[PDB]
Design a protein around this nucleic acid. Structure first.
Lengths: 305, 333, 109, 49, 293
RNA sequence: CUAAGAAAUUCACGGCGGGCUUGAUGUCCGCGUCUACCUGGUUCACUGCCGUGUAGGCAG
């Protein structure tokens, strides 16, 4: 929530074999909670020898080539899978279905901390790239860079110093470094607008998540409902149900020094604007709030509209 | 009673494309095989002269106005220095039977229009339209631009029906005023010829040869053709002079509007120079919309009163009505 | 209107930059409008005194041509041409043309 | 050809703003026209039936 | 009371192209049928010709007339703005005539400023001028551009006579047609100079010539009113006009030496400027050109 | 510290036989395209003897 002093950048992170399931009822894009987890993992393997912190993250999704197929001319789409090794007897395995996709995306990081003037810009940008090049991203690997040679630099700026037109000049540098991308920010505004326009029947949010990503067809007062943007149902965090257990209580945990809670995951609503719609590029960050007692974990996009 | 959906007429006073030739002295008694004025091209350095924004705070425009200029091609059809007479030669025919519609639809509207225009023609003749058309041929108003600053704009209109000449007309366009609706003798003989051609009692072929005396190689200005967004600056983007086969030329619809002034009762001031006859009588040469449909000087109001509603306008308005029933045009809804 | 104009600007920027080489050539009549806006960066072997033909080529010819193409294909109310909906649509078309010019006028700078 | 709006315009909307917007910058287009040459005066039409 | 949309003002003092022909020393009393300049080639392709090894005086041959009638714009829209412009031009016509502009154009026609590079090299730059209303002579004139300076505003009695006859042609009630025949003694085997296209030279029928817009901008060389350093004298007259071979902007919009501020205060606000600014206004309205955005 | 951490779909094949698409037609009228602009370019760090070396007293 602290307003950043820098916008670190990693311009083309081509990833392979990403996890395009993301939820029990979406399938397209890897969840933005994975991206905030990646930024926090960069903060844990960079921001201990630099005295900074990393919270903001941008999403642009240059191209999205999935790995799908449709069966027998139907209008649904099954996932294609991977084989598995054999058992002790060597017959066949219990093949469980998991999706898979291919992406690239840039990350607009945000450096809140004070270690920006104790180091030059290219040094911190270069070592953040050298650490981000060796880290699994959302269940998938990050591809390195070959001899095409052009986006190999990794930019940065300084939000704390500058004028209004100079910040617009840095914005004109950045938004042309991201020309074909499509941003991603979540809307409570439009979703509460749809609650308080469908509110006569029932305030159930699931029927209006289902009735918003839709090519809806109505009658005379052919007609298809329109929209200025391109909308998506994305998971917007976690909605923990259990009382928080002490660390040694739960059997078979990951480690025995941090507590566990059992969770169903929430659902909100996200969209896809070009980066040239909204002006300030501190509006395209995924901070995530958390609270101990209330079992509500959330991946917001604050300060946006 | 109402009009029809589609009315149309034909281009009575149909002119042709001009042939601007030139030559040496005293051969214009028998000017037959003189060379012509072509469309030849030359470069120009475009340094900007267009208007600029007030309070020019930025010296970037001070630099880029001159430091990065433009270079383009403008074609100029100068006469040869050994020649002085812009011989603008063209021809002009007159169909006649003006009120006969080319493609009407409604028979009753056609009946009232036929009898109303025949009432005009055999009541009050085409001599006023003939005198003003012979005046617009007598001067060089068909030359929209080349009349200004001349010695002797010497017209030679001739009448040909079979393969020989008849007589020799010799004029000026400085003794003949630009704006006078007078009545001379030989000009009314040629206007009587135009009256015989127009009213449908025969047929006439008028070729018009204006010896524009402009100078010993002085610049003349034929019409400019358009251009689209598929060509850059180099490649004659700015001006392209209209031409025929190895000669410059003048359009037919342009002369055919600059020979049809009857309307000198537009409301503002006829003393400010006459206009060209159109329904919704407008002059894009000065961009102003005379004969508003707000008023009752709209031609469509005039024709819908002189045919449909049976209320005849002034005689001068009726001269205007048949001026743009004889220029042609699309009509109807 | 402004949403479709901005989406078309972003898609045309992302799609016109496929090849890494292009300059003045035959059939380049779009290059008088899209030589810097609807076109990627050119080659890097010409003379160094050519940064004013693309740095100064703002979005007034290309963006003005896009606004004129939008106003020539799409239109407004013709029997209600004094009402406020056509005025709001004309202001939206002018704002879309100005936004496209401000977004694509820096194709050399 | 540089034209001018000259059909029967519907006089339920006659505003000098849009009328002068027509007449200042009129429509302009390319029209093809067949003419004779300079010397010739006839017109040989030939077909076969 | 506002600005009209499109302002058309045609080119008064409308020039023509400048032919070239070569004659010899002391053989120039019959300068009527000299041999012209043909286009030669030597070894980009530099197809620039030279004068022959016998003839040296380059007869530069061109004419000029005046259209006149600057009181009416060739295209306008408004009625009251046009009435204000007509009464302001009528105020100038009742104020003063064309004497000063004719004498400054005589200063242009006294030196050899119309020859941009052909002046250097010649020995006695003689300007032969006849008087033409038909195909004969009516009055003759001989000059020399070495006894007549380049920058200095001086008007001799002969220059006053020729400028007065030009002004009689200029006033709009009498027509004049005066040509210029100059003698560029370039030499016996030295370069001819036509105008250049976008080498890319220019030529005419069985001869060579020079373009007309260069003469039309050379004869309007009046501008001594740029505030930086007027040790160079007269330069070309345009709104935002200067010389483009140096690279420096003259008649800045930061001062009040622009035509547009003068026109706005001189027509709209009735804040009428002074006499020499009106001379600049009528100079760049008599050169012709487009006006209005 | 990422609905985290893991993954061999392989093997082979004959699409093939046949066919009348057809008859007729009016594109019809009509227009205002214009005022303009410097190449002598800074022309892409240049030609003719006795020395295939950073040497040239030039009708360049």
């Amino acid at each position: 929530v602290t307003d950043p002093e820098a916008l670190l950048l990693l311009p083309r992170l081509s990833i392979q074999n990403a996890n395009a399931i993301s939820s029990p009822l979406t399938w397209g894009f890897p969840s933005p909670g994975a991206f905030t987890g990646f930024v926090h993992a960069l903060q844990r393997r960079v921001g201990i020898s630099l005295d900074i912190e990393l919270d903001g993250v941008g999403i642009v999704c240059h191209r999205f080539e999935a790995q799908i197929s449709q069966p027998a001319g139907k209008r649904t789409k099954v996932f294609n899978l991977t084989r598995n090794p054999l058992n002790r007897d060597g017959s066949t395995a219990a093949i469980v279905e998991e999706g898979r996709a291919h992406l690239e995306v840039s990350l607009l990081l945000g450096v809140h901390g004070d270690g920006l003037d104790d180091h030059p810009a290219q040094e911190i940008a270069r070592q953040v790239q050298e650490q981000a090049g060796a880290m699994r991203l959302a269940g998938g690997s990050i591809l390195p860079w070959c001899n095409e040679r052009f986006p190999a630099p990794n930019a940065e700026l300084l939000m704390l110093g500058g004028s209004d037109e100079q910040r617009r000049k840095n914005q004109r540098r950045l938004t042309r470094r991201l020309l074909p991308g499509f941003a991603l920010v979540s809307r409570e505004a439009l979703l509460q607008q749809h609650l308080e326009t469908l509110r006569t029947t029932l305030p159930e949010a699931t029927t209006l998540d289902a009735l918003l990503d839709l090519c809806r067809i109505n009658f005379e007062p052919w007609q298809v409902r329109d929209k200025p943007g391109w909308l998506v149902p994305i998971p917007a965090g976690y909605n923990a149900l259990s009382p928080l257990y002490l660390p040694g209580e739960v059997r078979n945990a990951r480690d025995r020094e941090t507590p566990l809670r059992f969770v169903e995951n929430l659902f909100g609503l996200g969209e896809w604007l070009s980066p040239h719609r909204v002006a300030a590029l501190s509006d395209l960050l995924w901070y995530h709030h958390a609270e101990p007692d209330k079992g509500l974990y959330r991946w917001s996009t604050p300060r946006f509209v | 009673l109402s009009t029809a959906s589609v009315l149309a007429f034909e281009r009575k006073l149909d002119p042709s494309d001009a042939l601007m030739s030139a030559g040496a002295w005293a051969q214009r008694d028998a000017s037959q095989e003189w060379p012509a004025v072509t469309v030849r091209e030359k470069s120009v350095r475009g340094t900007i002269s267009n208007r600029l924004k007030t309070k020019d705070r930025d010296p970037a425009k001070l630099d880029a106005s001159i430091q990065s200029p433009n270079l383009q091609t403008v074609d100029v059809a100068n006469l040869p220095s050994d020649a002085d007479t812009l011989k603008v030669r063209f021809t002009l025919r007159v169909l006649g039977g003006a009120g006969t519609p080319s493609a009407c639809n409604d028979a009753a509207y056609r009946d009232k229009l036929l009898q109303t225009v025949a009432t005009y023609v055999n009541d009050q003749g085409f001599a006023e339209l003939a005198r003003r058309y012979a005046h617009n041929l007598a001067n060089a108003r068909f030359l929209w631009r080349n009349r200004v600053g001349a010695e002797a704009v010497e017209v030679r209109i001739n009448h040909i029906r079979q393969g020989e000449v008849a007589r020799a007309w010799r004029f000026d366009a400085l003794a003949i005023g630009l704006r006078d609706f007078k009545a001379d003798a030989e000009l009314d003989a040629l206007a009587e010829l135009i009256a015989s051609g127009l009213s449908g009692s025969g047929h006439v072929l008028l070729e018009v040869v204006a010896f524009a005396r402009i100078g010993d190689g002085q610049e003349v200005f034929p019409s400019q053709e358009l251009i689209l967004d598929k060509g850059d600056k180099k490649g004659q983007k700015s001006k392209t002079l209209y031409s025929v086969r190895d000669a410059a030329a003048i359009h037919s619809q342009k002369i055919g509007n600059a020979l049809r002034t009857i309307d000198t009762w537009y409301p503002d001031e006829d003393g400010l120079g006459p206009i060209a006859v159109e329904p919704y009588g407008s002059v894009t040469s000065q961009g102003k919309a005379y004969r508003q449909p707000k008023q009752k000087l709209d031609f469509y109001t005039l024709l819908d009163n002189w045919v449909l509603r049976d209320e005849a306008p002034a005689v001068e308005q009726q001269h205007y009505v048949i001026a743009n029933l004889i220029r042609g045009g699309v009509f109807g809804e | 209107v402004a949403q479709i104009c901005d989406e078309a600007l972003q898609y045309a920027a992302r799609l016109r930059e496929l090849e890494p080489g292009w300059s003045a050539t035959p059939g380049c009549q779009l290059h008088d409008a899209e030589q810097l806006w609807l076109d990627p960066l050119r080659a890097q072997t010409d003379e160094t005194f050519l940064q004013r033909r693309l740095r100064g080529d703002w979005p007034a010819e290309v963006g003005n041509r896009f606004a004129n193409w939008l106003n020539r294909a799409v239109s407004s109310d013709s029997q209600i041409l004094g009402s406020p909906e056509a005025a709001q649509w004309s202001q939206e078309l002018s704002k879309e043309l100005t936004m496209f010019k401000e977004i694509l006028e820096d194709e050399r700078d």
